[PDB]
Amino acid sequence: XXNXXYX
Numbered sequence: 223x224x225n226x227x228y229x
């Protein structure tokens with residue numbers, strides 16, 4: 223998975 227951004 224992961225995630226991230228930046229928004």
Ligand SMILES: *[C@@H]1O[C@H](CO)[C@@H](O)[C@H](O)[C@H]1O[C@H]1C[C@](C)(N)[C@H](O)[C@H](C)O1
Pocket residue numbers: 228
């Ligand atoms: C975001 O993820 C990458 C992993 O590839 C790390 O290298 C990066 O340092 C990390 O960003 C940090 C710094 C930030 C953007 N302020 C946030 O705290 C994120 C969660 O962590």
Ligand SMILES: [Cl-]
Pocket residue numbers: 225226227228
């Ligand atoms: Cl991302």
